[PDB]
Design a protein around this motif. Structure first.
Motif, PDB file in Angstrom:
ATOM      1  N   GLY C  55       0.798  -1.218   0.000  1.00 30.64           N
ATOM      2  CA  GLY C  55       0.000   0.000   0.000  1.00 30.64           C
ATOM      3  C   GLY C  55       0.834   1.272   0.000  1.00 30.64           C
ATOM      4  O   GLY C  55       0.585   2.188   0.788  1.00 30.64           O
ATOM      5  N   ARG C  56       1.817   1.325  -0.898  1.00 30.20           N
ATOM      6  CA  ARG C  56       2.721   2.468  -1.033  1.00 30.20           C
ATOM      7  C   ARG C  56       2.000   3.786  -1.301  1.00 30.20           C
ATOM      8  O   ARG C  56       2.338   4.824  -0.727  1.00 30.20           O
ATOM      9  N   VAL C  57       1.009   3.735  -2.183  1.00 28.45           N
ATOM     10  CA  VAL C  57       0.237   4.916  -2.548  1.00 28.45           C
ATOM     11  C   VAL C  57      -0.312   5.671  -1.339  1.00 28.45           C
ATOM     12  O   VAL C  57      -0.326   6.903  -1.320  1.00 28.45           O
ATOM     13  N   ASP C  58      -0.760   4.927  -0.334  1.00 28.99           N
ATOM     14  CA  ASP C  58      -1.335   5.519   0.868  1.00 28.99           C
ATOM     15  C   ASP C  58      -0.328   6.288   1.720  1.00 28.99           C
ATOM     16  O   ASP C  58      -0.533   7.469   2.009  1.00 28.99           O
ATOM     17  N   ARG C  59       0.752   5.625   2.125  1.00 31.67           N
ATOM     18  CA  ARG C  59       1.782   6.276   2.935  1.00 31.67           C
ATOM     19  C   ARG C  59       2.283   7.449   2.111  1.00 31.67           C
ATOM     20  O   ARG C  59       2.823   8.426   2.636  1.00 31.67           O
ATOM     21  N   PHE C  60       2.090   7.331   0.802  1.00 31.42           N
ATOM     22  CA  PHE C  60       2.477   8.374  -0.129  1.00 31.42           C
ATOM     23  C   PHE C  60       1.480   9.525  -0.037  1.00 31.42           C
ATOM     24  O   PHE C  60       1.831  10.687  -0.244  1.00 31.42           O
ATOM     25  N   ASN C  61       0.229   9.186   0.251  1.00 31.82           N
ATOM     26  CA  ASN C  61      -0.820  10.189   0.374  1.00 31.82           C
ATOM     27  C   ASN C  61      -0.587  11.005   1.637  1.00 31.82           C
ATOM     28  O   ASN C  61      -1.105  12.113   1.784  1.00 31.82           O
TER      29      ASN C  61
ATOM     30  N   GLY E  52      22.582   6.416 -17.899  1.00 29.25           N
ATOM     31  CA  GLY E  52      23.868   7.068 -18.031  1.00 29.25           C
ATOM     32  C   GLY E  52      24.115   7.710 -19.382  1.00 29.25           C
ATOM     33  O   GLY E  52      24.873   8.677 -19.484  1.00 29.25           O
ATOM     34  N   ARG E  53      23.473   7.190 -20.423  1.00 28.00           N
ATOM     35  CA  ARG E  53      23.676   7.729 -21.764  1.00 28.00           C
ATOM     36  C   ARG E  53      22.513   7.418 -22.697  1.00 28.00           C
ATOM     37  O   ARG E  53      22.347   8.062 -23.733  1.00 28.00           O
ATOM     38  N   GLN E  54      21.722   6.413 -22.337  1.00 26.00           N
ATOM     39  CA  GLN E  54      20.563   6.040 -23.136  1.00 26.00           C
ATOM     40  C   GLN E  54      19.474   5.488 -22.230  1.00 26.00           C
ATOM     41  O   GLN E  54      19.754   4.900 -21.181  1.00 26.00           O
ATOM     42  N   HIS E  55      18.230   5.685 -22.648  1.00 26.30           N
ATOM     43  CA  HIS E  55      17.079   5.250 -21.876  1.00 26.30           C
ATOM     44  C   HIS E  55      16.943   3.761 -21.591  1.00 26.30           C
ATOM     45  O   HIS E  55      17.387   2.899 -22.356  1.00 26.30           O
ATOM     46  N   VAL E  56      16.316   3.490 -20.454  1.00 26.02           N
ATOM     47  CA  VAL E  56      16.036   2.143 -19.991  1.00 26.02           C
ATOM     48  C   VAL E  56      14.603   2.209 -19.490  1.00 26.02           C
ATOM     49  O   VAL E  56      14.225   3.149 -18.785  1.00 26.02           O
ATOM     50  N   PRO E  57      13.780   1.222 -19.858  1.00 22.43           N
ATOM     51  CA  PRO E  57      12.381   1.207 -19.423  1.00 22.43           C
ATOM     52  C   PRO E  57      12.227   0.867 -17.948  1.00 22.43           C
ATOM     53  O   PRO E  57      12.934   0.010 -17.415  1.00 22.43           O
ATOM     54  N   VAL E  58      11.300   1.555 -17.296  1.00 23.10           N
ATOM     55  CA  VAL E  58      11.007   1.311 -15.895  1.00 23.10           C
ATOM     56  C   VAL E  58       9.495   1.205 -15.809  1.00 23.10           C
ATOM     57  O   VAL E  58       8.778   2.198 -15.658  1.00 23.10           O
ATOM     58  N   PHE E  59       9.018  -0.022 -15.947  1.00 22.09           N
ATOM     59  CA  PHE E  59       7.598  -0.300 -15.898  1.00 22.09           C
ATOM     60  C   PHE E  59       7.101  -0.118 -14.471  1.00 22.09           C
ATOM     61  O   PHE E  59       6.945  -1.088 -13.726  1.00 22.09           O
ATOM     62  N   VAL E  60       6.857   1.134 -14.098  1.00 26.03           N
ATOM     63  CA  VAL E  60       6.384   1.469 -12.761  1.00 26.03           C
ATOM     64  C   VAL E  60       5.114   0.709 -12.409  1.00 26.03           C
ATOM     65  O   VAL E  60       4.153   0.702 -13.178  1.00 26.03           O
ATOM     66  N   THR E  61       5.103   0.082 -11.238  1.00 23.58           N
ATOM     67  CA  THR E  61       3.942  -0.684 -10.813  1.00 23.58           C
ATOM     68  C   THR E  61       3.676  -0.620  -9.313  1.00 23.58           C
ATOM     69  O   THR E  61       4.490  -1.066  -8.504  1.00 23.58           O
ATOM     70  N   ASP E  62       2.524  -0.059  -8.957  1.00 23.67           N
ATOM     71  CA  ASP E  62       2.112   0.059  -7.561  1.00 23.67           C
ATOM     72  C   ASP E  62       3.228   0.457  -6.593  1.00 23.67           C
ATOM     73  O   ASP E  62       3.475   1.642  -6.358  1.00 23.67           O
ATOM     74  N   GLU E  63       3.888  -0.553  -6.031  1.00 26.38           N
ATOM     75  CA  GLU E  63       4.964  -0.370  -5.055  1.00 26.38           C
ATOM     76  C   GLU E  63       5.967   0.736  -5.389  1.00 26.38           C
ATOM     77  O   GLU E  63       6.402   1.480  -4.506  1.00 26.38           O
ATOM     78  N   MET E  64       6.330   0.833  -6.662  1.00 28.78           N
ATOM     79  CA  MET E  64       7.308   1.814  -7.112  1.00 28.78           C
ATOM     80  C   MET E  64       6.779   3.242  -7.215  1.00 28.78           C
ATOM     81  O   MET E  64       6.775   3.819  -8.302  1.00 28.78           O
ATOM     82  N   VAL E  65       6.348   3.824  -6.100  1.00 26.11           N
ATOM     83  CA  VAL E  65       5.839   5.189  -6.150  1.00 26.11           C
ATOM     84  C   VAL E  65       6.677   6.209  -5.378  1.00 26.11           C
ATOM     85  O   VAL E  65       7.154   7.187  -5.957  1.00 26.11           O
TER      86      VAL E  65
END
Lengths: 114, 177, 66, 78, 79
Positions: C55-61, E52-65
């Motif tokens: 629930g990262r979004v929440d602590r983020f809120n 460092g010199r060229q893009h790398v994809p970072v498929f952001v998902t939930d936890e990664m905020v």
RNA sequence: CGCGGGGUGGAGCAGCCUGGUAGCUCGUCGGGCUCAUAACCCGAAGGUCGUCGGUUCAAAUCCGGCCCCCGCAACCA
RNA sequence: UCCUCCUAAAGAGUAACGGAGGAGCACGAAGGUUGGCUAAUCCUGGUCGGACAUCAGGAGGUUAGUGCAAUGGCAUAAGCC
RNA sequence: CCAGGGCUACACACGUGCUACAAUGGCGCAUACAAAGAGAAGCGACCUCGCGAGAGCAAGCGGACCUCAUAAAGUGCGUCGUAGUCCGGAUUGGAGUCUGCAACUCGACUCCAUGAAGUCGGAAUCGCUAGUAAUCGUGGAUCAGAAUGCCACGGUGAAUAC
């Protein structure tokens, strides 16, 4: 006694006694005895069992021991699984908080050996 | 004894309506509870196995039967007919008393305890579990043990399925995750 | 049981600090006192402790307000 | 002894232009060793850049079985 | 643990990601804004942090905020 | 073909005769010493015991096979 | 020299610088006896414990063992206590 | 010219320093005693909030007047009982603070947690003869920030030179 896990020595001032529980430094210690209204001067044996019980009654709040380990260890796993930079460091057993890996940092990377 | 009666009462009936059982005999029931400690450290110290005997004895209340090796193996550096561990195949009311003396106190005393495996079963319902240290049982001085000598206990079930065995254990509540 | 080859197996009173005064056999020593009980152990309330995770979004809120 | 600047050739980029953009760190997939043949639909790995897996192959398909939204196509640039 | 007030990222990446939101599913993003941190609407996106010199994809998902984007873009290639 | 002996760290040798731990020497690497290299000094690593199979609980070792090196014989003719 | 099997032609016996392998002992218990028990090897679970200790169950069934080589024999055990 | 990265990379090696290995010591409590500096998008009291880092407030001060800033070892009492131990503080997590567009790479600091190696260092090797060495704390430049580095200040304060 048998507190939480077993920070159970004696003839050790109550505060220093309780420090030995995992997850509890002196700060939390005094916070405990004071909150339980005891005396950091006491030796656990002399302390009434009718008080030591109130100590468990005290330690219930602060997340501690095994539960704590599970939480933090989960926090780390949370990171390596995250694929995040720091997670990668833990994955490499190298310093995290940006240090001089080129020199010392021996603590993280393990004793000098190779 | 006490919860044995508990078994004789609630557990029995409950199961009769559980596995829609017919005859009372159709109910699975605990049989023999064994304690074992493959010390394996005696190979260097013969005075140590005795310490283990004092252990089980402390937890069993009866002289543990020592176990000699069944085959020689260099990987464990042992030979034939060689002492290597202590066991206790306690049964009857004694087993029952050991049981109450068990789950009611020692089990909750497991350090870092969360729950307990629901998995482990022999394929016949007979249960197995491993304690990690001898201190979990009150009678042990704790301070006087020269070493943490955890062991493992097994509970035989007259149950046939691993499932029906589990339900029997669930009768006594008995932890589990 | 064979004569004189087993420790003095004997009743003792498990006086927990939780109130459960369960008196049972054992072979300990005099009597016995325990902190908790099987009746009072959070293997049945430690569950709730286990639940709340993620629930990262929440602590983020919290780290938000805008 | 006859044994790579090609390890810096992907660094020379232009080998791929995923879903409408180039540069993107990617690489050859050991399974469908792609070449400018029948397309490519690169998978997005959580790390190590894109995992170009030619186009149409079990692994490329099983990632569909997992969470396919991670997967995207790519032309070839030059 | 920095800039207690006003979690920070910037308009070019901000606005552009917003455009990427309302426009539904999206293609990879070209960002150099490594410093920027992830936000709710950034979830599920295939944004590519310039490395460092060229893009790398970072498929952001939930936890990664809570984290900054570059934190998912290792810069030092290594042994 | 026959007989005899041996094959172990990078090199050369013990221990294999007695089955349960592979040691010494040089060499190698690290530091020191010196303006610098050597000599000297301090600290360390390192050996699937030819290979294949067998025996035993256990094989560098005990047994057989094969490959290699080497010593003796290879006679009356 | 002695023992085991093959050669040996279904009784015995049966040669070769034929083929394969052993023995020159061991033990006062491994002998007598009464009483008792029975494996190996695996699959499953089980603290340390792993391919391989100990424990529990299951399949299995003498593939085990039998002081030592082979052979015939062995659970009514000769085998294990 | 611009963005991002990089000068902070790490199998290892060396130099140079910080902090400890503890009892002439750690720790709480009480309390005594300097110098030398710096300062105007700079120092910023007292006061309030915050455990704290700090934050809101707003005097004063471009200066023997104001502030940075209460020096610390020391002194008293108490405690700790020779343990990897209340030593040690690294490492790691969690929660924060501040600066600056910006703190991931890659800042400093606070808090909670954690609590590693180390129980005086092989060969070898250095500084030092006086208010020196040793040991303690302070300031300054650089600087938004960012030292154990360096430059400077005072306290404490020896031994031995045959």
């Amino acid at each position: 006694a048998r507190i939480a896990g077993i920070n159970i020595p004696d003839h050790k001032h109550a505060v220093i006694a309780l420090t030995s529980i995992y997850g509890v430094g002196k700060t939390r210690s005094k916070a405990i005895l004071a909150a339980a209204g005891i005396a950091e001067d006491v030796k656990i044996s002399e302390l009434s069992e009718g008080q030591i019980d109130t100590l468990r009654d005290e330690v219930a709040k602060f997340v501690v021991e095994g539960d704590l380990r599970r939480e933090i260890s989960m926090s780390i796993k949370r990171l390596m699984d995250l694929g995040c930079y720091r997670g990668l460091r833990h994955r490499r057993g190298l310093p995290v908080r940006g240090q001089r890996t080129k020199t010392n940092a021996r603590t993280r990377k393990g004793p000098r050996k190779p | 004894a006490k919860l044995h009666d508990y078994y004789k009462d609630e557990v029995v009936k409950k199961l009769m309506t559980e596995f829609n059982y017919n005859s009372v005999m159709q109910v699975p029931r605990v049989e023999k509870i064994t304690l074992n400690m493959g010390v394996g450290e005696a190979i260097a110290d013969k005075k140590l196995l005795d310490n283990a005997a004092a252990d089980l004895a402390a937890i069993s209340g009866q002289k543990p039967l020592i176990t000699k090796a069944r085959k020689s193996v260099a990987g464990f550096k042992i030979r034939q007919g060689y002492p290597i561990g202590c066991k206790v195949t306690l049964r009857g009311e004694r087993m029952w008393e050991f049981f109450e003396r068990l789950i009611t106190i020692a089990v909750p005393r497991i350090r870092d305890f969360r729950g307990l495996s629901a998995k482990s079963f022999d394929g016949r319902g007979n249960y197995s579990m491993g304690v990690r240290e001898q201190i979990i049982f009150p009678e042990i001085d704790y301070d006087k043990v020269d070493r943490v000598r955890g062991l493992d206990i097994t509970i035989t079930t007259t149950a046939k399925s691993d499932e029906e065995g589990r339900a029997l254990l669930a009768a006594f509540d008995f932890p589990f995750r | 049981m064979k004569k004189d080859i087993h420790p003095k197996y004997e009743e003792i009173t498990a006086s927990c600090s939780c109130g459960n005064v369960m008196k049972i056999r054992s072979t300990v020593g005099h009597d016995l006192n325990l902190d908790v009980c099987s009746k009072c152990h959070p293997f049945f309330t430690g569950k709730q402790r286990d639940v709340a995770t993620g629930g990262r979004v929440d602590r983020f809120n919290k780290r938000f307000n805008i | 002894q006859l044994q790579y600047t090609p390890q810096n050739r992907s660094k020379d980029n232009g080998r791929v232009v995923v879903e409408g953009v180039g540069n993107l760190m990617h690489h050859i997939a050991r399974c469908c060793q792609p070449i400018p043949g029948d397309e490519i639909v690169g998978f997005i790995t959580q790390g190590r850049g894109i995992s170009v897996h030619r186009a149409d192959c079990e692994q490329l398909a099983e990632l569909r079985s997992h969470a396919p939204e991670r997967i995207v196509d790519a032309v070839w640039g030059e | 643990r920095s800039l207690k007030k006003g979690p920070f990222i910037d308009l070019h990446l901000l606005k552009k990601v917003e455009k990427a939101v309302e426009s539904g599913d999206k293609k990879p993003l070209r960002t150099w804004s490594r410093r920027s941190t992830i936000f709710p609407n950034m979830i599920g996106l295939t944004i590519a942090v310039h490395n460092g010199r060229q893009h790398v994809p970072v498929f952001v998902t939930d936890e990664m905020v809570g984290h900054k984007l570059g934190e998912f873009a290792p810069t030092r290639t290594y042994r």
